[PDB]
Amino acid sequence: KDPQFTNVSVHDPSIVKDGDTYYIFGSHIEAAKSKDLMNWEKFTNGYTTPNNKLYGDLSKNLAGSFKWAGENDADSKGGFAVWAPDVFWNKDYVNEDGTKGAYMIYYSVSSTYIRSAIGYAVSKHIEGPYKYVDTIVYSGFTKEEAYDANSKINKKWTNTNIPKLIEQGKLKGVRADWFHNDGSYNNRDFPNAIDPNLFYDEKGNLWMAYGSWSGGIFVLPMDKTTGKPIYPGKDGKTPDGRLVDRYFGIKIAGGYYQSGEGTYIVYDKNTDYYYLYVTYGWLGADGGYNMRQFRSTSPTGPYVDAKGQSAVLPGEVDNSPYGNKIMGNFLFERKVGDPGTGIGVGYVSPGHNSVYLDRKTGQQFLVFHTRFPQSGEYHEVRVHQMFMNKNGWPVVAPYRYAGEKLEKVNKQDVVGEYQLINHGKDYSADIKKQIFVRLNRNNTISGDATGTWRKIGHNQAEITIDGETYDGVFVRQWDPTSKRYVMAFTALSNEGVSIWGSKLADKTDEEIVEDVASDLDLGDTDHVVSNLHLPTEGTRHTVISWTTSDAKVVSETGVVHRPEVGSAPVTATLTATITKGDATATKVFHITVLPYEEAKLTAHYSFDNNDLSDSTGNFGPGTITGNRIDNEGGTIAYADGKIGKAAVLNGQSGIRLPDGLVSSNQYSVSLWVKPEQLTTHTTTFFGAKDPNHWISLVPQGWDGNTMLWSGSSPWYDGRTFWKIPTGQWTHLAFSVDNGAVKVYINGVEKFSGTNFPDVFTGANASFALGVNWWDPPFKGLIDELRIYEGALTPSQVTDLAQT
Numbered sequence: 001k002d003p004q005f006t007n008v009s010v011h012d013p014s015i016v017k018d019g020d021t022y023y024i025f026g027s028h029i030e031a032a033k034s035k036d037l038m039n040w041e042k043f044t045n046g047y048t049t050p051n052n053k054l055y056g057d058l059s060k061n062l063a064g065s066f067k068w069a070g071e072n073d074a075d076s077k078g079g080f081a082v083w084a085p086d087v088f089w090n091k092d093y094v095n096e097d098g099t100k101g102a103y104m105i106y107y108s109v110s111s112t113y114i115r116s117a118i119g120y121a122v123s124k125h126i127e128g129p130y131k132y133v134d135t136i137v138y139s140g141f142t143k144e145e146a147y148d149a150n151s152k153i154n155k156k157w158t159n160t161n162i163p164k165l166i167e168q169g170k171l172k173g174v175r176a177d178w179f180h181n182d183g184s185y186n187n188r189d190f191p192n193a194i195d196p197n198l199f200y201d202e203k204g205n206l207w208m209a210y211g212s213w214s215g216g217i218f219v220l221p222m223d224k225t226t227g228k229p230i231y232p233g234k235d236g237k238t239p240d241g242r243l244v245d246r247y248f249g250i251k252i253a254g255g256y257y258q259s260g261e262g263t264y265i266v267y268d269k270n271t272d273y274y275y276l277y278v279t280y281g282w283l284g285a286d287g288g289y290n291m292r293q294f295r296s297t298s299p300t301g302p303y304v305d306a307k308g309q310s311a312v313l314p315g316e317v318d319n320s321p322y323g324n325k326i327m328g329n330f331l332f333e334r335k336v337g338d339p340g341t342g343i344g345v346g347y348v349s350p351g352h353n354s355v356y357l358d359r360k361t362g363q364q365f366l367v368f369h370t371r372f373p374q375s376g377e378y379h380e381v382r383v384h385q386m387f388m389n390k391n392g393w394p395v396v397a398p399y400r401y402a403g404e405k406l407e408k409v410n411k412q413d414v415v416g417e418y419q420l421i422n423h424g425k426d427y428s429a430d431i432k433k434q435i436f437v438r439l440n441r442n443n444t445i446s447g448d449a450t451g452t453w454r455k456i457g458h459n460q461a462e463i464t465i466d467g468e469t470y471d472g473v474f475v476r477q478w479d480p481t482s483k484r485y486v487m488a489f490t491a492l493s494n495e496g497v498s499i500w501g502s503k504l505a506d507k508t509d510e511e512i513v514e515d516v517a518s519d520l521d522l523g524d525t526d527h528v529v530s531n532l533h534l535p536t537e538g539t540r541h542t543v544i545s546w547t548t549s550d551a552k553v554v555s556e557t558g559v560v561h562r563p564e565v566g567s568a569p570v571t572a573t574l575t576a577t578i579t580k581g582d583a584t585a586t587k588v589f590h591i592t593v594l595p596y597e598e599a600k601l602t603a604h605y606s607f608d609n610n611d612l613s614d615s616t617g618n619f620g621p622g623t624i625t626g627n628r629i630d631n632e633g634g635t636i637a638y639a640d641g642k643i644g645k646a647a648v649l650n651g652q653s654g655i656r657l658p659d660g661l662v663s664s665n666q667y668s669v670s671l672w673v674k675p676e677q678l679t680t681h682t683t684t685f686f687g688a689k690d691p692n693h694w695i696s697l698v699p700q701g702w703d704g705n706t707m708l709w710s711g712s713s714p715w716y717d718g719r720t721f722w723k724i725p726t727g728q729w730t731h732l733a734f735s736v737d738n739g740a741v742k743v744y745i746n747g748v749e750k751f752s753g754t755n756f757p758d759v760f761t762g763a764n765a766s767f768a769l770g771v772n773w774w775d776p777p778f779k780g781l782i783d784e785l786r787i788y789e790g791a792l793t794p795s796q797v798t799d800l801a802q803t
C-alpha cells in the first residue's frame with residue numbers, strides 16, 4: 001500500500017490549478033484541494049449562509065439570479081440550487097477597481113427540470129469569496145404570464161435579460177420557436193441552461209458550452225474582458241445542418257429531450273483537436289451515468305465520434321450508439337480466492353467530468369464523481385489519467401491515478417493472464433464485469449476471447465478481437481484489491497468501444513486451487529435455517545463442485561430441509577471439490593439444519609368483547625387516536641367480523657398500542673383486513689421507535705400493491721407484487737427472525753428477503769393500527785390482531801388463514 005488516498009464528496013467537479021495546487025469546485029458550493037491529485041481536502045461549508053465560503057451572503061450576493069431560480073422556489077423550495085460550476089483564471093478580465101486578472105466562476109441555478117439560468121461571479125483569489133456580476137443565459141421562460149407549482153415567479157420571457165438584449169440591438173427580437181403553442185418553453189430543440197464549461201481555443205479565444213438534457217448542448221463565444229456572451233444575433237444552420245440560435249448559440253451535441261450534460265471541451269495542440277466530453281444518462285445509482293467523447297477540428301463543431309457520428313442527435317432517439325463510451329458501470333469482481341477482500345473495485349454511474357491538461361508535459365486527467373456498488377447514492381471524486389492513443393483519442397486508465405506515468409515497458413512484463421472489461425455502448429443500472437484472457441508471448445490472445453496483440457514502441461498497445469482493433473497503451477497502475485502495482489492496458493476500437501485490462505499475478509494451478517479453498521467459507525453451518533449459497537466458480541474459471549452426504553438435509557445446491565416441529569435437528573456433509581487444470585483441492589463443511597420451532601402467541605386483540613383488550617393478559621388495552629398516531633379524537637365501533645366482532649376504522653380514527661408491544665428481532669404479526677377503500681401508504685400495522693425508524697404493513701404501497709415497508713434509515717421494500725381486494729376479507733401476516741423477513745397473504749408466502757432492520761430492540765417503540773404520522777387513516781375493519789415472539793412456521797400461517 002505505498003500510495004495513499006484521501007477522498008471527498010464534490011459532485012460535478014471542475015478541476016482547476018492555482019500555483020501548484022489542484023482545486024475542484026462542485027455543485028452545492030462544495031470545493032476541495034490537493035497537491036497530488038490523490039489526497040483531497042475540502043475547504044467549503046456547503047450551503048451555509050451567510051459566511052458561506054465561496055459567496056459570503058449567498059442570498060444578497062447572488063440575488064441577481066435567485067430572482068429567476070435556485071432560491072426557495074419550486075424544486076428549490078426550502079433551500080438552494082447552485083449547481084455544476086466551472087472556474088478558471090481569466091487574465092484579461094477587468095475588475096471593478098479597473099485592475100486586470102480574476103478567477104471567474106460560472107454557476108447554474110435551477111428550480112425545475114427546465115427553468116434555470118447561468119450566472120457568474122469573480123474573485124481575485126481562487127478560494128474566495130466570489131462576487132456576483134451578471135446572470136446571462138436563461139431557460140424555461142414562457143410566452144405569457146406563467147407560474148410553476150410552489151413559485152410566484154412570472155415565468156414570462158420579459159423577466160429574463162432578453163428585453164435588455166433587444167434594447168441594445170444584441171437581438172432583433174423574440175424567436176417564436178422558443179415557445180410551443182400553449183406558449184410553454186420549447187425544450188425539445190432548446191436547452192436547459194445549466195452546466196457551464198468555459199474554454200479557450202487555438203488562438204486563446206474564449207467559449208462557453210452549456211446545456212443538460214432538453215434541446216441539448218450549445219456553445220457561445222465569450223467576451224474575454226467582461227465575461228459576457230457575444231450572442232449570435234441571428235438564427236441559421238451551420239454547414240452540416242446543426243442549429244444556430246440568435247441567443248442560445250450553436251447546438252453542438254444532443255437533442256430531442258435526450259440525455260447528455262456536464263459538458264467539457266478541451267483543445268489539444270499536440271493533435272489540434274477539440275475534444276468534447278459529455279455524460280449520458282441519469283446521475284443516480286439506477287441511472288447508468290456514463291461519460292462520452294467526441295472530437296472536432298473547430299471549437300464550434302461538428303463534433304463526431306470514432307465512427308464519425310454526430311454528437312447532435314437526428315431525432316428523439318436512443319443516444320446509446322453516439323460518442324465513445326469511455327467509462328460506465330464496471331466491476332473487477334472478486335471471486336472466491338482472489339486476493340484482497342470484499343467485492344472488488346468498480347464504479348456506479350461515474351460522470352460529470354472535467355479534464356486537466358498539463359501544458360508542459362502533455363499529461364492529462366479525467367476528474368469526475370462516481371457512486372459505488374452497494375453504497376447507494378454515496379459519492380466520492382475520482383481521478384483517472386488519460387493518454388493520447390495513436391489515432392488522436394485520449395484513452396482512459398482503468399484505475400484511478402496513483403503517481404504512475406507513461407513508460408518504457410518490456411514485453412516479458414506484459415505477457416500473462418489478464419482481467420478484461422469491455423465498456424460497450426449500452427447503459428443501465430447493469431454493471432459490466434471482467435472476463436479472463438491471456439496475452440501470450442507469440443502475440444496471440446487466448447482464453448475468454450481470441451485474437452492478437454503487439455506493443456509498438458515503449459508503450460503503445462494494439463489489440464485485435466473478432467475483427468475489432470482497439471488502440472491504446474500499456475501502463476502500470478495501482479490495484480487496491482491485490483495491493484500491488486500491476487501492468488494494465490486501455491484501448492479504443494473504431495466503434496468507439498473501450499476495453500480495459502488488468503494483469504493478474506502468475507500462479508500455478510496448484511496455487512490457485514489452494515487460494516480458493518482458503519477463501520471458501522459458508523459462515524455459520526451450525527444453526528442453519530435457510531438455503532445456503534454454494535458458489536460454483538472460483539477465481540480464473542476454477543470449478544467448484546459440491547456433493548452432499550445426505551440430500552434430505554441439504555441438496556448439492558444448498559437447498560435445506562428444516563425438520564418438523566418437535567423433530568431432531570439433522571446433519572450432513574458438504575464437500576467442495578475445487579478444480580483448475582489437473583490441480584485439485586477439497587474443503588468440507590459439516591452442516592446442522594434446525595427444525596422449526598413454533599412461534600409463541602404473546603398478544604391477541606380480538607376485539608371480541610367490544611373493547612381493545614389483550615385476551616392473553618400480557619398487555620394493557622389499546623386506546624383511540626385521531627387521524628395520526630400521536631393525536632386523539634376518534635371513534636371505534638364494533639361491527640361483525642371475520643372471527644367474532646371486528647374493529648371499525650372510519651378513516652378519521654385509529655388505535656394506539658402499548659409501547660414495546662414488540663421488543664425483539666424474533667417476532668411475528670397476523671391480522672385480517674376488510675378495507676372499504678385504498679389510499680397509498682396508509683398503514684394497518686404500524687410500529688416505530690421514531691419517524692425515521694418505523695415498519696408499516698401497507699395494503700397499497702408506493703408501487704400500488706400490498707407491501708411490508710420500513711424506513712428511513714434504511715429503507716426496505718417488502719414487495720408482494722400482489723393487489724388487495726376491497727370489501728372482502730384478506731388475511732395478512734409477517735415473520736421476522738434475526739435479519740430474515742417473510743410475508744404471507746391468505747396463507748401464501750409472497751415475499752422472502754434478507755437484511756431486514758432491527759427496529760424493536762435497542763430502545764422502546766410505539767405501535768398502532770390504521771394511523772401513522774403522515775398518511776390517511778385506514779378505512780374499514782381490522783380483525784384478530786395476533787402478535788408472536790418467534791418467526792411463525794409456514795404451517796402455522798396456513799392454520800391462521802384457516803378458521
Ligand SMILES: OC[C@@H]1O[C@@H](OC[C@@H]2O[C@@H](OC[C@@H]3O[C@@H](OC[C@@H]4O[C@@H](OC[C@@H]5O[C@@H](O)[C@H](O)[C@H]5O)[C@H](O)[C@H]4O)[C@H](O)[C@H]3O)[C@H](O)[C@H]2O)[C@H](O)[C@H]1O
Binds near residue numbers: 702712774
Ligand atoms: O410529522 C412531521 C414529519 O415528520 C418527519 O418525517 C420524516 C420522514 O418521513 C418518513 O417517511 C414517511 C413516508 O414518506 C412519504 O412518502 C415519500 C416516499 O419517499 C420515497 O422513499 C423512497 C422509496 O423507498 C423504497 O421503497 C424505494 O427505494 C423508494 O421508492 C418514496 O418513493 C416516496 O413514496 C409518506 O407520506 C410517508 O408514508 C421518513 O422516515 C422520513 O424521511 C418530517 O420531518 C415531517 O414530514
Ligand SMILES: [Ca+2]
Binds near residue numbers: 084195263264
Ligand atoms: Ca461541468
Ligand SMILES: [Ca+2]
Binds near residue numbers: 641642643644645646
Ligand atoms: Ca374478532
